[PDB]
């Protein structure tokens, strides 16, 4: 019978929770593991795996140390990055994606502005906060 | 001083920042302020972004009426830590230097407010509190500033 | 009964009683407002009682296990001044006046000492 | 007192008012 | 403008 003491310590579920989270866990398992029980089974050169916004090439950079079609090869090449492979993006229509990258680049700058006075004017601040 | 000129060899004497501090100190003791200022300076030299004790700088140069030079010190030092006592009694000192006073005193009660037990704020409120032509808090924070440190 | 004895201008019944009170409440229990009390009542009793190294060791005990008490310190510089431990004296008279500024037989007790300390 | 303003106001402002009366060192 | 008259 399907375990769930890690659950909830309250040792009795009632049965309608027990099949909301069987069928929530397999799913969410199913995702993961493919891009049935858990109590069964748990289980399935540079160190680093992976970094979000990293394709395999960057990490080969990394371990060494270091014109419309072109264009739309560049379109897709930044949302790949900054979606961390999403799948979506190829069902999108082209010219859905040129004001997603014009907002891209322009919310983008907008954090490095964000990443990067008198005697008497400036000791109010402290006073007042 | 004797001990200075005889038991201490020049090259610690003019290198090692504690005895520059020990020394302006000392001459300020003996009321000698054409020779601490000197050697205050060359102590900013060594590093300007250090507070240890500026309540004696601050005293000798609002002496000395040099407002720039306070202007710079007291920038530098509330820049590099907002919350040291000496640093609001170095702008309160200056804001005493350049005229107004209920708001030096309003510096100088929030310096205590960072360290209750910061006596040399308590009995510089004390001084200026003359400047105000007023007694009763006049002699109350002297009371409360002789309470902080028994032997001032 | 320690302090209505006391207050009966009979201080020696209430000095034992307060005796065998601080005994009983020795072993246990420092804290929690009750050896604070039993202190201090004993100590105001040995300050009546004219013995003051005794007074002065319970206050100091009791100052220990609180140190805001105005009360405590113009105590303490009362018995500072009674004896001729004037540095004592004036340092708990200056924190008492830090721990409440207007104080009304402080003021000319901090005089009194200044004095006595500038003629000595 | 103010019992009437100009143009037949209702009201007054103030917008100043002020009293004037007559009458080497450690720091 | 307020202050109406009579």
Avoid at chain 2, 56 to 70: G, M, P
């Amino acid at each position: 019978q399907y375990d769930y003491s890690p659950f909830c310590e309250r040792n009795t579920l009632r049965e309608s929770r027990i099949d909301s989270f069987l069928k929530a866990e397999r799913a969410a398992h199913c995702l993961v593991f493919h891009k049935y029980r858990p109590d069964i089974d748990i289980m399935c050169s540079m160190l680093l795996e992976s970094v979000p916004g990293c394709n395999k090439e960057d990490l080969e950079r990394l371990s060494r140390r270091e014109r419309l079609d072109d264009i739309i090869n560049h379109e897709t090449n930044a949302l790949k990055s900054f979606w961390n492979d999403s799948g979506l993006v190829n069902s999108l229509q082209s010219h859905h994606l040129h004001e997603e990258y014009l907002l891209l680049q322009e919310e983008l700058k907008n954090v490095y502005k964000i990443k990067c006075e008198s005697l008497r004017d400036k000791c109010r601040r402290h006073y007042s906060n | 001083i004797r001990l200075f000129e005889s038991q201490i060899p020049s090259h610690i004497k003019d290198t090692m920042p504690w005895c520059l501090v020990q020394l302006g100190k000392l001459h300020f003791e003996i009321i000698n302020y054409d020779m601490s200022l000197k050697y205050f300076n060359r102590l900013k030299d060594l590093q300007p972004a250090r507070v240890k004790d500026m309540e004696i700088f601050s005293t000798l140069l609002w002496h000395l009426h040099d407002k720039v030079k306070s202007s710079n010190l007291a920038n530098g030092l509330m820049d590099t830590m907002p919350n040291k006592p000496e640093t609001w009694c170095c702008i309160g000192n200056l804001l005493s230097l350049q005229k107004d006073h209920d708001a030096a005193i309003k510096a100088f009660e929030k310096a205590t407010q960072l360290d209750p037990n910061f006596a040399y704020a308590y009995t510089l409120q004390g001084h200026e509190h003359s400047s105000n032509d007023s007694s009763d808090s006049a002699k109350t924070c002297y009371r409360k500033a002789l309470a902080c440190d028994p032997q001032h | 009964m320690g302090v209505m004895y006391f207050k009966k201008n009979e201080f020696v019944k209430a000095k034992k009683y307060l005796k065998k009170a601080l005994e009983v409440v020795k072993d246990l229990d420092p804290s929690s407002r009750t050896t604070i009390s039993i202190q201090l009542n004993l100590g105001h009793t040995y300050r009546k009682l004219n013995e003051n190294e005794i007074a002065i060791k319970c206050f100091r005990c009791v100052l220990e296990k609180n140190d805001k008490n105005s009360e405590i310190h113009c105590s303490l510089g009362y018995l500072y001044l009674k004896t001729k431990k004037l540095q004592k004296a004036i340092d708990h008279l200056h924190k008492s006046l830090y721990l409440k500024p207007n104080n009304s037989s402080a003021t000319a007790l901090l005089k009194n000492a200044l004095e006595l300390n500038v003629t000595l | 007192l103010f019992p009437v303003n100009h143009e037949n106001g209702k009201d007054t402002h103030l917008r100043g008012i002020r009293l004037y009366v007559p009458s080497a060192i450690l720091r | 403008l307020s202050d109406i008259t009579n």
